[PDB]
Design a protein around this ligand. Structure first.
Ligand SMILES: Nc1ncnc2c1ncn2[C@@H]1O[C@H](COP(=O)(O)OP(=O)(O)OP(=O)(O)O)[C@@H](O)[C@H]1O
Ligand SMILES: [Mg+2]
Lengths: 578, 471, 41, 470, 193, 193
């Protein structure tokens, strides 16, 4: 137990002297109040400590004690449906303890200790046990929660408690050597949880938005980034993913973004319904909220805590989704700390190791054969907030090179209140090919062909815009104008989607395939008609364009009949032209 | 606390800083009193403390100081302000010393000016609907109580006039919402930073005319006043606002007059300290510092109060990518952006609907709050105006005669919009009149082109012509 | 075309100016760091 | 054996050791912490007072009371032998395929020694990459450095793997020829995600290409110093094989943008003032030391080629990385986003592509006598066709002449049957046959660039030869 | 010091049609006249000096050509004051700091000019201060900051330039002087971007 | 040192009609030849070396690509001097370099070449110096300047680039040697933006 005394206080940084023996990146308690802090540099007998709480009011000469362990998170039952601060401190308990304001120094355990869980042992006395094997099971909000042997524990089981009600502190299992395995276990947040193997992504992460789920898919082990200037709709898109994604558990990490978003989540999600289980949606989500005005140093801790919790739930066998609300704020926190350290910046003041940190964070995503033998996954969808919409910021460029999918928002579309406001030209996805076998078996035998046809039509429209901007949109010939109009129909009736509607908010793959079929059939018939001499000025007046436009809003159950009717109507309308 | 401690031995004075050698006892963030030979007392705040010395940022100018006779003494370990219920109807300077000629307020409590973050769990959904009386705001960029809505101004646009108009006309509408009828008016907390005498006189005259001085608090930091004082005025104003709102059930409207001057003061202090600048020389922690000011607004569960914010911010080169607007947009909830093109044409208030935004609109407009058709009308107006502007750009390259009839209709709609919806002078339009004008304008377009709106609302409201309202 | 070319030149000059200022600040902070290292390592 | 325990400073990626005069600059060291874990490190500055060590990985457990630094090797070296063929490495040389480590024939320094200009000779033979748009219009000659510029989302990795699988030499076409000419492919991937690693391993192991290729795979989350070292180790092995066993080695560097970013990060870590656009001032010389280790030397039958693959940051051709790579290399094969979105694979755009050494590796006794003229004619015809296709959107198809309509059809047929060759491997003769079939669609006598003899000899075939059996 | 600032409600008739008609400036107001070289800053300022209706005019050549001050000297004595009838030079005070004179003196010149204008305001007159170039004042600040080894904010200027300009301009305004009389000061500062 | 510099009174016959007639370069003059790809710059430079009136030809390759330098090195030996009928290499000096060679060598290549040319001038001959790719030399200079942490100017080049270019191009000129003979150095420096 090393002890020292503060020597210099400068913002979130504290330099303590007399700490000869402290280790880099170990949690230390600063001052009488015991503010948490992390060592990030050792000079002689002095340690540079960044404090995860406001340091206003401290004094020189106050004690600083190092715990000797790196930042750790308590993993175990009791985390779902909760809300946590940057360093895994429950915020409901803080609300009960203090008033409506967060205050420094509150000590609260991550997992409730007074709540009893129904324990059903799986292992038996005298049997082998290895890291990641399932000791037992515990019910939790309709989930089945598996108690896992920590990743680096081995031995033979001496005695196991019989099925009953216990608290997380109870030593449910005792190994031969004498170690007692409770219902939880700490784990450094900076160390990736070990796994057996990494599998190639072969399943889609249905986000519920047509554009993302069709033109720019993200696999079950994938990573996606959604940059865009303020007002482009990043928060709405990520909340939609949290609401409608097919993941079993959703970890939302508000790394230094507006406070009101967390309140929106807390107040809405308890009332919505989980798409699959059917129970309350808040029972499948964990919120790690670190609002903008909360201490700056805690943003990196929040990101790491979130990813570690996601990795735990993966190790349980679930498929998880991790929404990093803003990684640019993580970069900014790193920059402020570096400034306090007086290092040598690179680029726009960011420390050199920013790219390495981002790569380390992202490479924890992927589909995995957990240590227990089951299969799980983690999908990371991290937003980026470049200043002034610059896609040349170091953060965005560093993200371009490790993310498999890119969803670039646009200011021009956002101004016209056209959402999701994805700039089609700039976005891309590298999971398109690896997902084809799944689409051919669970959406439609020819879904890839329709997707490619729609992409080709949009590309032709983009090519023709180069001319339209030059010679007006009326000097074009008939075929080119038909391409332009079909491009408009695709933009306004397929890609567009009102996240606030009661029906259009979610769109299964069958619905998207049907709408694509409708548009492509219409285009084929219209091109045929134009060949034989019909006038575009009258093709745009047909009464089936209205049905194609309204196809978005029809419910998910009525859609098949509506689609059959629409196809028949298309055939009839273009046949009657003779 | 009762005894008085003094530190001689100053060893450095340059710009806004000041170093004291043996100030090991001084606490980080403490407030100190600097006394010179003549006997004058200035203020300062510790921003770094160490065994070797302590940095003090002097609020007032450093003229007259010296390394021989100057002394530094402690006042409080943490910056505090003496809030009280009786400070309504009083004027204070950037630090809190009265300037109205009345005696100092007997504090009910002393609160830390820096404040504390609001627990996300204890926050509440901002729902109530404020009727700002400006159609471009009430209809398309709704303002809900408990919201942060900066007014991105320009070099010489009338942002102050719009802020005064909102303060004067803003009233909630219980009748539409179905809540108990009451008429509790807004309390105004007016934080000023580098305001020229002209703007300050205008604001004072407007408040006197509307009678709002009886229930408003002013924190004036005029242009000629010391620059580093600006780092405290927003925090003190918001401390007063939060105290009133969440300890007395007041609906407080906070107006910060020029956040650009605040950012200038912050840049001065940061550059004097050798901070790693971000873009354009501003310090790297400007985002967090501005967050600590803005994010002190909202609504709290179990308390009837509410703190609203309207930070007025002047974009330097009418530039929206300047660091100050960028960070303010990333922190606040939407923005009302004035435009120079509309101003030159004579429109007032020259709010540009396209770049503006309001992220809390959907929580305050809809069935049972304002009217069934609000959201769809707003969306359709956005789409129509955007098409009108795109066609207006096309004309200047392809000539008027080339337009079809649809394009001409959209262009006429854009012109009529700019001249009948945005431009409203100083009149106080209710939400109903604004929606009526919106439908009157939308009637110009064909019924088949209003794709955003549902058919029921189209049937119910479509048709009434703009000529009926005027001419 | 000449208008777009002029705008391109203007933006290039502005960005180069910003980069030059950044290098200057970097050089001075490096000098201060070197001074501190020489004084106390 | 000797352990320096006088640590006096740890911060980020650096740590200082006192009484370390004995250590040599650029030496590799092992840092042992209290728990017993061992991290790597490289000395970056040695002084009478102390020695600065840049740590690989992280510094999460170090402290000033127990950390000890011990020497490993005076100057970075790599064990090299013929047996490397069929293996995989992590960028520092440690295997990652699970097979036993190699027993080196000799240990060579990683940093390369410059080739003597008077000891080089002109590139005069071609490599058949199997991609028609490269083998015909932008040939790749032994000893050439021909980068493949790509974009953010384009399939650079797929093209790299295809070139690795298909590239072969054609000794028969050269005069009497020889029965055998050994060939090897050294693959150096820098900063590639786990998905890309799985894809590369599967693609190399699926078709027996691993039996003649050496892979230096470096993950994105691995230390950046390993990223800096990966291309140098790969090129060291390539030089060894080529110039000491007479191999014809082809080196693919998967992402030079990641290498440049790692170089920038390292330069910033050592307190160096950045040069242009925030990149190190000496990036030109570093990229030269990597690129210019390829060539052909006099008196040795071997050769080393390179196909650097760099993703232009924002499709900017004037960004420092593509610009410097252009100065130092000869030509570029530029992938296009338009062709990719249209569904064409590989999406190579012949219009901006160029190969500066093509005229030397083409002609009689190498390919066929009509290669150069066919390439020129295809380039001209495609440019004209794309221009006419732009014009038709304004003037309408009926208002074109006959030859313009022919060019408009030819552009589409070219884009569909020449570029869009998919995964099929095309010999040089098949590519030339398809080129002649496409040119046949144009009216003879409009093939101005080609001499009359070739037109007579080859003109006339039908496009159905390849359509009926792709 | 002053008792109370007042609201500008009378015009500062500059004798130029465009300014006095389309873009007026009140008696106690402030104006800026940016313009590239060869646009008319000097002639406009001299016209403001010659014909304006200010009781006393203070001209501050904060870093400009010496020929301008010489022209003022050699012409003004002959001209006639519109309102008093005497020579025009009897109501103008010049503060000449030409370009090649010491750099650091530009700041002092600006401050001395504004102080003298404030004095003549305190006496009851209406004054007009014409700062010939505040960009040269900014350059002086930049040079001194460079010697101090401070950190530049943008383009090399010290971060406190805005505060200095604000303090200089805020001294304009119509006022009830401490003696009870009414006075004003108008500042028309040129800028040379 | 030279005894005295003379005026450009005689031409440097390059043997090519366009250059010798429409765009002559005087003996002791300087010329620039931007080299794109496919423009046959190599052939033009070899023609200048073969046919010009210069007695000795110095060719400097500052930082040429590897294979371009290989072509250069393997093409001169085969050239045939038209006057003596023997190899042209018996009257030329080649200074070769490549991008991977040390920066100092690339930076000093042109100075070494020009000093050798000055020597052969002092003997009493007429020397033709052909500094190919002075842009690569500028790149080497920029790298050296950044190594010393100098402040750049323009597109990252050091502020003294023009000074060095002048110091290199002004050693050309026909002069009366210290020994009373007559000699000249003519520089033809390529530029490759
Ligand atoms: N109002 C005017 N009437 C007539 N001629 C004018 C007027 N203003 C300017 N000029 C002419 O234009 C010239 C430029 O004007 P002036 O000397 O005021 O330039 P300036 O804007 O101060 O520029 P600089 O800083 O380059 O000297 C004047 O010398 C005179 O020739
Ligand atoms: Mg002038």
């Amino acid at each position: 137990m090393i002890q020292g005394v503060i020597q210099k206080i400068a913002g979130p940084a504290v330099i303590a002297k007399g700490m000869l023996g402290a280790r880099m990146y170990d949690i230390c308690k600063v001052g009488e109040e015991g503010l948490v802090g992390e060592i990030i540099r050792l000079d002689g007998d002095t340690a540079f400590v960044q404090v995860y709480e406001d340091t206003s009011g401290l004094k020189v000469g106050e004690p600083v004690v190092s715990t000797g362990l790196p930042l750790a998170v308590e993993l175990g039952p009791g985390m779902l449906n909760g809300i946590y601060d940057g360093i895994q401190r429950p915020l409901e308990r803080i609300r009960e303890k203090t008033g409506i304001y967060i205050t420094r120094g509150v000590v609260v355990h991550a997992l409730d200790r007074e709540k009893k869980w129904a324990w059903t042992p799986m292992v038996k006395p005298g049997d082998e046990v290895r890291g990641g094997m399932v000791l037992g099971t515990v019910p939790e909000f309709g989930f089945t929660h598996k108690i896992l042997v920590p990743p680096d524990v081995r031995g033979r089981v001496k005695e196991v408690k019989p099925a009953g009600e216990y608290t997380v502190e109870e030593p449910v299992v005792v190994l031969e050597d004498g170690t007692e395995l409770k219902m939880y276990h700490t784990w450094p947040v900076r160390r990736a949880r070990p796994v057996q193997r990494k599998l190639d992504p072969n399943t889609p992460f249905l986000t519920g938005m047509r554009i993302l789920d069709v033109l720019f898919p993200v696999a079950m082990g994938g990573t996606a980034a959604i940059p865009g200037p303020f007002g482009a709709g990043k928060s709405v898109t990520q909340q939609s993913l949290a609401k409608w994604s097919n993941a079993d558990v959703v970890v939302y990490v508000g790394c230094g973004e507006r406070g009101n978003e967390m309140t929106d989540v807390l107040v809405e999600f308890p009332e919505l319904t989980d798409p699959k289980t059917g129970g309350p949606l808040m029972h499948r989500t964990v919120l790690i909220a670190n609002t903008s005005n909360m201490p700056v140093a805690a943003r990196e801790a929040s990101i790491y805590v979130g990813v570690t919790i996601a990795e735990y739930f993966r190790d349980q066998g679930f498929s998880v989704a991790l929404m990093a609300d803003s990684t640019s704020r993580w970069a900014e926190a790193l920059r402020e700390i570096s400034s306090r350290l007086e290092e040598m910046p690179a680029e726009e003041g960011y420390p050199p190791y920013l790219a390495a940190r981002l790569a380390a964070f992202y490479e924890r995503a992927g589909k995995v054969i957990t240590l227990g033998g089951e299969e799980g996954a983690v999908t990371i969808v991290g937003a980026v907030s470049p200043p002034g919409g610059d896609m040349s910021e170091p953060v965005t460029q560093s993200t371009l090179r490790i993310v498999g999918a890119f969803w670039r928002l646009d200011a021009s579309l956002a101004f016209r209140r056209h959402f999701p406001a994805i700039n089609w030209n700039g976005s891309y996805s590298l999971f398109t090919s690896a997902l084809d076998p799944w689409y051919r078996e669970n959406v439609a035998e020819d879904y890839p062909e329709l997707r490619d046809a729609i992409s080709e039509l949009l590309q032709r429209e983009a090519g023709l815009q180069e001319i339209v901007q030059l010679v007006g949109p009326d000097a074009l010939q008939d075929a080119e104008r038909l391409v332009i109009e079909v491009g408009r129909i695709i933009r306004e009736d397929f890609l567009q989607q009102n996240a606030y509607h009661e029906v259009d908010a979610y769109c299964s793959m069958k619905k998207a395939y049907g709408i694509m079929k409708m548009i492509l059939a219409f285009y084929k018939e219209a091109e045929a008609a134009i060949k034989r001499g019909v006038s575009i000025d009258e093709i745009l007046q047909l009464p089936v364009l209205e049905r194609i436009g309204r196809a978005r809003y029809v419910s998910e159950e009525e859609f098949p009949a509506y689609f059959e009717e629409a196809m028949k109507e298309i055939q009839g309308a273009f046949k009657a032209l003779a | 606390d009762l005894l008085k401690k003094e530190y001689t031995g100053i060893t450095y004075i340059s710009g806004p800083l000041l170093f004291v050698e043996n100030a090991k006892d001084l606490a980080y963030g403490a407030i100190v009193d600097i006394k010179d030979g003549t006997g004058r007392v200035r203020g300062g705040q510790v921003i770094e403390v160490s065994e070797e010395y302590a940095v003090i940022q002097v609020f007032e100018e450093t003229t007259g100081l010296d390394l021989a006779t100057t002394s530094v003494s402690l006042v409080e370990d943490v910056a505090r302000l003496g809030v009280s219920k009786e400070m309504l109807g009083r004027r204070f300077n950037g630090i809190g010393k009265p300037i109205d000629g009345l005696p100092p307020i007997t504090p009910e409590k002393r609160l830390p000016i820096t404040g504390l973050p609001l627990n996300p769990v204890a926050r509440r959904k901002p729902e109530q609907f404020i009727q700002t009386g400006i159609s471009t705001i009430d209809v398309m960029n709704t303002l809900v109580r408990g919201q942060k809505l900066p007014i991105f101004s320009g070099s010489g646009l009338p942002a102050n006039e719009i802020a005064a108009q909102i303060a004067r006309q803003a009233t909630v509408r219980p009748d539409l919402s179905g809540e108990g009828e009451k008429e509790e008016p807004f309390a105004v907390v007016f934080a000023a930073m580098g305001i020229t005498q002209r703007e300050l006189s205008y604001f004072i005259q407007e408040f006197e005319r509307t009678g709002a001085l009886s229930r408003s608090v002013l924190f004036l930091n005029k242009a000629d006043d010391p620059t580093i004082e600006r780092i405290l005025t927003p925090r003190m104003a918001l401390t007063v606002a939060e105290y009133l709102a969440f300890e007395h059930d007041y609906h407080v409207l906070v107006i910060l007059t020029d956040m650009t001057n605040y950012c200038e003061a912050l840049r001065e202090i940061g550059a004097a300290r050798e901070e790693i600048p971000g873009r354009r020389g501003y310090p790297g922690y400007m985002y967090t510092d501005l967050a600590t000011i803005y994010e002190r607004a909202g609504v709290v569960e179990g308390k009837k109060g509410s703190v609203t914010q309207i930070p007025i911010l002047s974009m330097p080169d009418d530039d929206r990518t300047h660091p100050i607007p960028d960070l303010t947009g990333y922190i606040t909830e939407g923005q009302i952006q004035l435009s120079r093109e509309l101003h030159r044409k004579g429109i007032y208030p020259p709010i540009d609907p396209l770049p503006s935004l309001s992220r809390l609109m959907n929580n305050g407009v809809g069935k049972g709050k304002t009217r069934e058709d609000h959201k769809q009308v707003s969306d359709q107006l956005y789409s129509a105006y955007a098409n009108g502007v795109d066609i207006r750009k096309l004309v200047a390259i392809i000539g008027e005669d080339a337009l079809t009839e649809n394009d001409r209709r959209y262009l006429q709609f854009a012109d009529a919009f700019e001249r009948f919806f945005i431009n409203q002078g100083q009149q106080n339009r209710s939400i109903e009149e604004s929606l009526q004008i919106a439908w009157a304008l939308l009637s110009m377009l064909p019924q088949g082109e209003l794709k955003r709106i549902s058919k029921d609302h189209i049937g119910k409201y479509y048709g009434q012509k703009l000529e009926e309202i005027w001419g | 075309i000449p208008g777009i070319r002029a705008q391109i030149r203007f933006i290039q000059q502005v960005l180069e100016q910003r980069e030059r200022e950044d290098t200057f600040r970097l050089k001075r902070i490096k000098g201060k760091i070197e001074a501190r290292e020489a004084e106390e390592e």
